[PDB]
Design a protein around this ligand. Structure first.
Ligand code: CLA
Ligand code: CLA
Ligand code: CLA
Ligand code: CLA
Ligand code: CLA
Ligand code: CLA
Ligand code: CLA
Ligand code: CLA
Ligand code: CLA
Ligand SMILES: CC1=C(C/C=C(\C)CCC[C@H](C)CCC[C@H](C)CCCC(C)C)C(=O)c2ccccc2C1=O
Ligand code: SF4
Ligand code: SF4
Lengths: 144, 80, 116, 38, 740, 153
């Protein structure tokens, strides 16, 4: 209900909806050639328990977690104020935003066009996409 | 009982009788201050010496001194 | 603020000196009768017996040099712009480049990042 | 903005610096022993 | 009863965190003094010393409730983690006896790895006495995976409460009207919390008992233990382990309740397999408590018109000696957030003590009675918790007459009389304290005299037969004959401390018919002495907090004030908070003597070993049959023989309990710096150091000043308690590990 | 008092300490990984005794040392463990003193003691060569003070 709290809430939704989509378009992309084909022998070597505790990938994930830090340390102040960081994509978007508003009469609020639906669809779908494939060994009951 | 002695640092802001419990001090017209008041303690026989005027006393070194003297029924604050 | 500016600039000059300090040596220890062949060979080969004495003497002499360079900066009563504005930028560009150049050799073979 | 002012408080700065001083000493007694040369 | 919400009242901004002392304008504009640094934290929790708008005070304390609640959840979520990453709970699940408890490891940095106690189970570390392993075994937890899932599930609940205490405030906010619904509050605390809580855990230990009862008590390996869902997915498995589950909620509606007798029983006593109470009696117990709370949770006016209310209930109770009795107590508790806290701290404080007694008397957890370190630690733990809580009850029952009591608004002639004949209450308690002191401790002086004098202690033997086995002996005999006679449906006593000559042993003695004698009448009256003195000084601080004979204008000064001055012969330490400061000390003496009594008397006559060639041989075999009557035996055979288990441990892994033992006397005697000296001399001591600070200008802008007169005593009692608990904390954790 | 490499009453303590540790060492299986670290711990124990033997140490096995200034034992007092304390402590102290010099000015004195801009804390590194410069500035402190102290009356 308050300003500064819902700010981080809607931001975190946007800051992860793209992450919850490039990962889906990344996990599907890496397994597009091994989705079926005898169910990839129950995910084959892609099973996390089969991995050797990420021996070779741990030192790589540390580098990724480092660069991703400053990436979000650019996202934290670029959101602050309009100028510089957000202002240049500001008038860029305003170029399609003007045409989209012309198609949508007075203004056609883009956040109602698809800022919340995409943001929540990615989160909910990725939450269910991580449980059906990574959080169930014995099914017991058939899953449909 | 207790011996009340008033310094020459008085400003006359009446802090004594405001703080003071049983009204030992008293404001008197005086010709050598800014506000024109001076604290004076006639009823020193009834003084208890609780030393709550030195708290409200403004001056760098307090203006109302009460040196500890003898103790009687009037200065012990007892009801028996 | 101002304190970072002064440091951030002095270290930028130290950087610009460090690359040229290694450019003459590396180009001397790679081709033509080099006193140091591969980067893995002469990593810590001792020389003569004193060794540490000439090192500590070089340390003391360089320390006295910076001692005078600082004490002179105190005196003189110096002072109490676009070139300075470009220099404030390339100083930051220097400090972050000279850590990475050595980070290269710290990879043993400069290949562990890309998996194999 | 104001988060840096809260980061600049006496207790936060004190705990941060004391964490640095304590961790350096934990790593010192874990790594090389004092060589000490006469 | 109405949804009245004031959405958005305080914004979410770091602006207040930038200002040190935003909660008070007096603690913001003038931080020029060292005393301000301590005042910022002393008044940080005195929420009634900021704003008077109750709609905001209620919206600053329920926030602190959720904050403290989040701290507790962060605390509990780690306990399940420590018993999985580095511990021995699974190995202890297979072998419970030889493997000592442990759930804390040290690192090789400065040779501290000596603290790694060899407990067994392929894992070394520090022994634990928190009862975690007993609780986890009583919860059916076997695999390490069940620890991590509970911990990760605790992180979610811990985060939701932070986003709740930050919700009803910076985001939402109920009105003031939502808090006078005390009628609607007890209908949800006694039925939603107590009721559904006693029912939810009841429904758990009915389907999770057999992984502990009809499995781990038979002799199956932890790997052969089936899964908890395999018993629910197949009702016939529960049906075979209990031939009552075949029905499946069919005689529950037919009122054929006797067909549920395989899990729901009233046996009594302990089980001769686990080591504690029956796993089937507690399930029926919580079911019985749940239904009682589902009934007791419907007693006050909601928004349908039926039921009583705290209003007219108290508006109806009268009484001859009370006059206008009980009336206005509704306005007492529904207006002062403080007012609820003393009755809460009082009841809950005595509750922690009473539940501590119920711990050792009837051990409710399996493998808890034999675990002597855990049992000894838990009793005294809740013992001291309730000591602090009851003194806090006095601390705030003193707050009420000063901060929220008026001679026009809230009125009970009962509380009026407690303040009208106030000089009579304490006079009675005073004479009671003196009679219980000049005798209970007088007899200690008497007996200690009789021994050093000669043949007087010899002729005291007949009096040693008196008092002891004279009273309370018939009470135990009532409980011996209570089953069968006055308890036809009970085949055992309330606890084996009642059943005479009935001893239950599982390679180590669990409980014993505590045969009173020699000096239990002595220590129980030392207790009653230290109890009446504690109640006296705290109740004195309660009812003398408003009207005092010496100084009539008492309400003007406050609660945490030094004094008035050298007048009237000397007005010094007259605040009710000082009656709590010293009330903490007599509570300290009370709880100290009680923990001494409990701890030592246990191994004296209760705790021991068993052999077939004989019968019972205690750790310390029946010593306080004589060494308790005199003061000397309390430091000749008690405080002296304990150094052989706290100091003779540097060669082993119990060296830390000796360092903390000798170091707790340091901070305790460090309290002797503040409790004896005065601010005047120390303030003359700074200005010399400030002179040295003015010599080099190294004087801080914050002018160096001494501690406050009240803050010095608050720190003094803090050290007198911390240094006065960590010694016995190191002592209770010293012998019990060596003689375990 | 003889050195411990020749003091036969010191090596016996090493043997006795390892003997007391060995009973705790042998009760558990050495092949277990959670107790394979005990051999590394006793390696630390062994690697600790050899350095102290060089220092003169008590015949009793309680290893004593020297603070008179003897150049053979300057390592236990004078040079290392002592002078660094003085420098490191005073590198903090004179840095604090420089911060005390910049504690006045217009912005409130209380704000410049507590809520300081982090930049002053980052400048702390200035004091590489305190000694005589600090002596000058401390002279100036006593000087500009001009004997302005408390009354004490
Ligand atoms: C020469 C630099 C150096 C090196 C090589 C190490 C190396 C190591 N440190 Mg360490 N540390 C350092 C500096 C260094 N530290 C400094 C400057 C501090 C603050 C004063 C710390 C504080 C610290 C703590 C608190 C801990 C470690 C720990 C560790 C060990 C593993 C965890 C880790 O830190 O991962 C990588 C480091 C980062 C991601 C940062 C590892 C061998 C852990 C340990 O094993 O305890 C001994 C641990 O608890 N370090
Ligand atoms: C208040 C609860 C609490 C307490 C008292 C401790 C205490 C401890 N933890 Mg722990 N921890 C906790 C909660 C807690 N933890 C939670 C909720 C998690 C996440 C599930 C962890 C996860 C964790 C890991 C992964 C490790 C520890 C470790 C440790 C020990 C090393 C000390 C340390 O570095 O931390 C700091 C201690 C303090 C700052 C003082 C206690 C704080 C209270 C509130 C004051 C120490 C005895 C380390 C260890 O034991 O090595 C195996 C270790 O590696 N903890
Ligand atoms: C800084 C060191 C340190 C830390 C971080 C911990 C942390 C912890 N200890 Mg521990 N302990 C320590 C030193 C420490 N201990 C020492 C030196 C001893 C003597 C050898 C013990 C003996 C001990 C025992 C016997 C037990 C613990 C237990 C525990 C856990 C229970 C939580 C708790 O007590 O919260 C903190 C409690 C407080 C009162 C601190 C809050 C008050 C303010 C912040 C101070 C916890 C993770 C229990 C456990 O089950 O382990 C998992 C347990 O039974 N400890
Ligand atoms: C008449 C009330 C009553 C009584 C006598 C008990 C008694 C018991 N409870 Mg219990 N409990 C109660 C109410 C009660 N509970 C309610 C209302 C809840 C819901 C919050 C719980 C939730 C609860 C849990 C989650 C657990 C227990 C457990 C236990 C057993 C060991 C803990 C203990 O000794 O503390 C006893 C507490 C009291 C004596 C205070 C109750 C007094 C009320 C206010 C009257 C024990 C026999 C533990 C267990 O099952 O043992 C294996 C366990 O883990 N209780
Ligand atoms: C071994 C030291 C010692 C002794 C022998 C006593 C003895 C006594 N105290 Mg005392 N007390 C002590 C230490 C001691 N205290 C300390 C250190 C404090 C500071 C916390 C207090 C604070 C204190 C208070 C606030 C009060 C007492 C009271 C009493 C008297 C209770 C009446 C009685 O039962 O008479 C028995 C005689 C003997 C046992 C001999 C009693 C004579 C109470 C009192 O005056 O009577 C009601 C009282 O209110 N004490
Ligand atoms: C009718 C079902 C029932 C069952 C099966 C139990 C079973 C049990 N209760 Mg319990 N209790 C009950 C109802 C029940 N209670 C009710 C209605 C109340 C009042 C609200 C209590 C109040 C109560 C208290 C205060 C305590 C127990 C305790 C206990 C345990 C001690 C063992 C024992 O001596 O037997 C029965 C225990 C009795 C005290 C006798 C029956 C209860 C009353 C007094 C008759 C035991 C497992 C003790 C405990 O929690 O263990 C730590 C304990 O101190 N109960
Ligand atoms: C500057 C003067 C001074 C000093 C240096 C000490 C020093 C000490 N006093 Mg002492 N005391 C003093 C003045 C002083 N006192 C005065 C003026 C009085 C009033 C007359 C007292 C009254 C007093 C009492 C009543 C007691 C002490 C005790 C102690 C010892 C505490 C043991 C300890 O934890 O140390 C350090 C040891 C450690 C193991 C550190 C713990 C490390 C943790 C685990 C971290 C200690 C060596 C206590 C004692 O030991 O009895 C002899 C004790 O009970 N003092
Ligand atoms: C300088 C000597 C000295 C001093 C001043 C003390 C002082 C104290 N001891 Mg200690 N003690 C000492 C030597 C000393 N002891 C020695 C040599 C041993 C044997 C190693 C012990 C063993 C010991 C134990 C086991 C205990 C104390 C306890 C206490 C405290 C009693 C708490 C109290 O008064 O409540 C009231 C106490 C009574 C009315 C009795 C007290 C501060 C107790 C304690 O500290 O509780 C936290 C306690 O448990 N002492
Ligand atoms: C055992 C505790 C301990 C230890 C090992 C150290 C160690 C160190 N301190 Mg330090 N210090 C300590 C306690 C400690 N301090 C305390 C309690 C305070 C008061 C809060 C300070 C205040 C302090 C200041 C102001 C400075 C240091 C600085 C330093 C470093 C001096 C070398 C350098 O980096 O230049 C050094 C590593 C210096 C530093 O590193 O600058 C950032 C520095 O100027 N310390
Ligand atoms: C010592 C003492 C004081 C003075 C108490 C003081 C000065 C408390 C000192 C405590 C602080 C915390 C120590 C100073 C440490 C600074 C906060 C610096 C810390 C910086 C880093 C280490 C974090 C009294 O005011 C007093 C009053 C009445 C009776 C007895 C006494 C008494 O004995
Ligand atoms: S306290 Fe002193 S200055 Fe104040 S009114 Fe009284 S005499 Fe005047
Ligand atoms: S001595 Fe005490 S009673 Fe008399 S005026 Fe001063 S404060 Fe009041």
């Amino acid at each position: 209900t308050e300003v500064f709290s819902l700010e981080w809430l809607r931001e975190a939704e946007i800051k992860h909806c793209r992450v919850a989509m490039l990962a889906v378009l990344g996990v599907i992309a890496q397994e597009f050639g091994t989705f079926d084909f005898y169910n990839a022998k129950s995910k084959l070597q892609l099973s996390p328990d089969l991995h050797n505790q990420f021996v070779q990938n741990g030192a790589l994930q540390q580098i990724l977690l480092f660069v991703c830090a400053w990436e979000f340390i650019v996202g934290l102040p670029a959101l602050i104020e309009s100028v510089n960081g957000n202002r240049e994509p500001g008038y860029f978007g305003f170029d399609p935003l003007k045409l989209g508003g012309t198609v949508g009469s007075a203004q056609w609020k883009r956040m109602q066009a698809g800022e919340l639906r995409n943001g929540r669809l990615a989160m909910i779908a990725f939450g269910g996409f991580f449980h059906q494939q990574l959080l169930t060994k014995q099914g017991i009951i058939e899953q449909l | 009982a207790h011996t009340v002695k008033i310094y020459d640092n008085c400003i006359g802001c009446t802090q004594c009788v405001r703080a003071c419990p049983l009204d030992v001090l008293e404001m008197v017209p005086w010709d050598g201050c800014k506000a024109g008041q001076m604290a004076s303690a006639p009823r020193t026989e009834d003084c208890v010496g609780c030393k709550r005027c030195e708290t409200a006393c403004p001056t760098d070194f307090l203006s109302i001194r009460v040196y500890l003297g003898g103790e009687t029924t009037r200065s012990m604050g007892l009801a028996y | 603020v101002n304190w970072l500016q002064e440091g951030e600039i002095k270290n930028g000059r130290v950087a610009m000196l460090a690359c040229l300090h290694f450019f003459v040596t590396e180009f001397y220890q790679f081709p033509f009768f080099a006193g140091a062949p591969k980067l893995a060979g002469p990593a810590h080969d001792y020389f003569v017996k004193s060794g540490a004495m000439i090192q500590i003497l070089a340390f003391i002499g360089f320390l006295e040099f910076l001692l005078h360079r600082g004490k002179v900066l105190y005196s003189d009563m110096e002072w109490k712009k676009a070139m300075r504005d470009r220099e404030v930028n390339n100083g930051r560009l220097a400090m972050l480049g000279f850590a990475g150049i050595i980070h290269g050799e710290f990879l043993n073979g400069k290949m562990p990042f890309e998996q194999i | 903005m104001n988060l840096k002012k809260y980061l600049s408080t006496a207790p936060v700065v004190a705990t941060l610096w004391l964490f640095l001083t304590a961790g350096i000493l934990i790593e010192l007694n874990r790594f090389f022993p004092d060589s000490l040369f006469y | 009863v109405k949804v009245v919400v004031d959405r958005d009242v305080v914004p979410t901004s770091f602006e207040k965190w930038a200002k040190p002392g935003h909660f008070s304008r007096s603690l913001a504009k003038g931080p020029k003094t060292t005393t301000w640094i301590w005042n910022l934290h002393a008044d940080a929790h005195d929420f009634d010393s900021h704003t008077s708008s109750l709609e905001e005070v209620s919206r600053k304390i329920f926030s602190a409730h959720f904050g403290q609640l989040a701290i507790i959840f962060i605390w509990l979520s780690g306990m399940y983690f420590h018993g999985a990453r580095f511990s021995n709970y699974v190995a202890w699940l297979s072998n419970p006896t030889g493997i000592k408890p442990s759930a804390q490891v040290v690192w090789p940095i400065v040779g501290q790895q000596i603290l790694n106690a060899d407990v067994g189970g392929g894992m070394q570390g520090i022994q634990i006495t928190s009862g975690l392993f007993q609780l986890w075994r009583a919860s059916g937890i076997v695999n390490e995976l069940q620890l991590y899932v509970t911990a990760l599930g605790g992180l979610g609940m811990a985060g939701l409460m932070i986003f709740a205490g930050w919700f009803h405030y910076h985001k939402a906010a109920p009105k003031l009207e939502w808090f006078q619904n005390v009628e609607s509050m007890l209908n949800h605390h006694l039925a939603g919390l107590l009721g559904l809580g006693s029912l939810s855990w009841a429904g758990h230990q009915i389907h999770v008992s057999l992984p502990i009862n009809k499995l781990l008590d038979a002799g199956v390996a932890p790997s052969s233990i089936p899964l908890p869902h395999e018993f629910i997915l197949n009702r016939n498995l529960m049906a075979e382990l209990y031939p009552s589950f075949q029905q499946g909620l069919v005689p529950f509606f037919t009122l054929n309740w006797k067909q549920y007798s395989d899990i729901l029983t009233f046996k009594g006593g302990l089980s001769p397999v686990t080591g504690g109470l029956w796993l089937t009696d507690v399930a029926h117990h919580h079911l019985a408590i749940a239904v009682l709370f589902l009934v007791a949770g419907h007693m006050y006016r909601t928004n349908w018109g039926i039921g009583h209310s705290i209003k007219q209930i108290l508006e109806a109770h009268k009484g001859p000696l009370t006059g206008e009795g009980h009336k206005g107590l509704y306005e007492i508790l529904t207006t002062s957030w403080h007012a609820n806290l003393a009755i809460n701290l009082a009841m809950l404080g005595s509750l922690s003590i009473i539940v501590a007694h119920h711990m050792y008397a009837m051990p409710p957890y399996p493998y808890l009675a034999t675990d002597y370190p855990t049992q000894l630690s838990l009793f005294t733990h809740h013992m001291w918790i309730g000591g602090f809580c009851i003194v806090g009850a006095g601390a705030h029952a003193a707050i009420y007459m000063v901060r929220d009591y008026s001679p026009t608004v809230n009125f009970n002639n009962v509380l009026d009389r407690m303040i009208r004949h106030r000089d009579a209450i304490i006079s009675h308690l005073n004479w009671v304290c003196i009679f219980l002191g000049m005798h209970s401790f007088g007899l200690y002086i008497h007996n200690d005299t009789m021994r050093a004098l000669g043949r007087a202690q010899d002729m005291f033997s007949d009096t040693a037969i008196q008092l002891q086995p004279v009273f309370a002996q018939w009470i135990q005999q009532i409980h011996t004959l209570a089953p069968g006679n006055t308890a036809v449906n009970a085949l055992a006593t309330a606890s084996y401390a009642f059943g005479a000559d009935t001893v239950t042993v599982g390679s180590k003695i669990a409980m014993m018919p505590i045969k009173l004698g020699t000096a239990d009448f002595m220590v129980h009256h030392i207790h009653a002495f230290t109890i009446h003195v504690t109640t006296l000084i705290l109740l004195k601080g309660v009812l003398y907090a408003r009207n005092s004979r010496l100084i009539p204008d008492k309400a003007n000064l406050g609660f945490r004030f030094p004094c008035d001055g050298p007048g009237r012969g000397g007005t010094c330490q007259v605040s009710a908070w000082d009656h709590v400061f010293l009330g903490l000390f007599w509570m300290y003496n009370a709880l100290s003597i009680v923990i001494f009594h409990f701890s030592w008397k246990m191994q004296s006559d209760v705790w021991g070993t068993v052999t077939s060639n004989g019968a019972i041989s205690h750790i310390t075999g029946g010593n306080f049959a004589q060494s308790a009557i005199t003061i000397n035996g309390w430091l000749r055979d008690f405080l002296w023989a304990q150094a052989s288990q706290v100091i003779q441990s540097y060669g082993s892994s119990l060296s830390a309990y000796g360092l903390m033992f000798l170091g707790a006397h340091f901070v305790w005697a460090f309290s002797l710096m503040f409790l004896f000296s005065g601010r005047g001399y120390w303030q003359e001591l700074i200005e010399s150091i400030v002179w040295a600070h003015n010599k080099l200008k190294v004087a801080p802008a914050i002018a160096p000043r001494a501690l406050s007169i009240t803050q010095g005593r608050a720190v003094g009692v803090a050290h007198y308690l911390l240094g006065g608990i960590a010694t016995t904390w190191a002592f209770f954790l010293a012998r019990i590990i060596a003689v375990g | 008092l003889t050195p411990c490499q020749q003091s036969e009453a010191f090596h016996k303590r090493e043997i006795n300490e390892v003997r007391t540790l060995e009973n705790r060492q042998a009760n558990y299986e050495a092949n277990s990984p959670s107790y394979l670290a005990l051999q590394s711990q006793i390696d630390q124990v062994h690697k600790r005794f050899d350095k102290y033997g060089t220092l003169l140490c008590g015949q009793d096995g309680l290893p004593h040392l020297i603070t008179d200034g003897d150049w053979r034992h300057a390592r236990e007092f004078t040079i290392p463990a002592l002078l660094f304390l003085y420098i490191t402590g005073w590198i903090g102290w004179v840095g604090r003193s420089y911060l005390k010099y910049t504690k006045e000015t217009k912005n409130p004195t209380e704000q410049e003691i507590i809520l300081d801009v982090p930049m002053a804390l980052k400048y702390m590194l200035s004091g590489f060569l305190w000694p005589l410069s600090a002596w000058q500035e401390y002279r100036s402190g006593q000087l500009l003070a001009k004997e302005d102290e408390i009354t004490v009356s």
